[PDB]
Amino acid sequence: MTEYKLVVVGAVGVGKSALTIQLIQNHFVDEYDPTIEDSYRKQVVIDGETCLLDILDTAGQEEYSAMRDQYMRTGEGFLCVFAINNTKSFEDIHQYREQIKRVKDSDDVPMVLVGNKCDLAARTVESRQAQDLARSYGIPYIETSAKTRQGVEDAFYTLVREIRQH
Numbered sequence: 001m002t003e004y005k006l007v008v009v010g011a012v013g014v015g016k017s018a019l020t021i022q023l024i025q026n027h028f029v030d031e032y033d034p035t036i037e038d039s040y041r042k043q044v045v046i047d048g049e050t051c052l053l054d055i056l057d058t059a060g061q062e063e064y065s066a067m068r069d070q071y072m073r074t075g076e077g078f079l080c081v082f083a084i085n086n087t088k089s090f091e092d093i094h095q096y097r098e099q100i101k102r103v104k105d106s107d108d109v110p111m112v113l114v115g116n117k118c119d120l121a122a123r124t125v126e127s128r129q130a131q132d133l134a135r136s137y138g139i140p141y142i143e144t145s146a147k148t149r150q151g152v153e154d155a156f157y158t159l160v161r162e163i164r165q166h
């Protein structure tokens with residue numbers, strides 16, 4: 001069975017854990033320990049292919065585990081997440097991308113830019129702003145809501161499809 005190693009990165013509070021838990025449990029967690037970092041597994045069929053997603057939900061910027069290092073080095077694709085009502089998290093994307101490019105020694109790394117919490121009113125980051133950032137990286141942009149599930153499968157499945165074009 002094909003396995004796809006995905007890593008979810010982005011600022012604290014953007015909904016990395018909520019997105020991951022939504023994908024695996026079909027539930028929205030209103031609070032989830034911000035320090036728990038763990039990998040999760042999900043068997044899924046994507047475009048007629050039965051495959052396994054191996055997803056590290058990264059947490060914190062304390063000194064990385066061997067596992068986090070391993071996932072950064074061996075991860076095949078990255079979900080770079082900000083929240084549409086969190087301008088700083090969006091501005092921080094640059095750093096997460098620079099980090100990924102550094103670890104992969106490449107500017108050609110499967111990656112999807114995710115604008116999460118799209119169920120909330122009065123966003124401070126416009127869709128077009130994020131579209132422009134993603135375009136500058138040569139990557140897709142997808143809006144999601146871990147709360148309503150909108151876009152959540154599309155974000156993870158698009159990243160699989162990006163890995164397959166690699």
Ligand SMILES: Nc1nc2c(ncn2[C@@H]2O[C@H](COP(=O)(O)OP(=O)(O)O)[C@@H](O)[C@H]2O)c(=O)[nH]1
Binds near residue numbers: 117120147148
């Ligand atoms: N309204 C809304 N809240 C969200 C969404 N995703 C995450 N949250 C909330 O934002 C906070 C941070 O989420 P969490 O998954 O811990 O963020 P993490 O630090 O990136 O792992 C929690 O209170 C979540 O309930 C979403 O799509 N919509």
Ligand SMILES: [Ca+2]
Binds near residue numbers: 124
């Ligand atoms: Ca503005």
Ligand SMILES: [Mg+2]
Binds near residue numbers: 016034
């Ligand atoms: Mg978390």
Ligand SMILES: [Mg+2]
Binds near residue numbers: 101102103104105
């Ligand atoms: Mg390097």
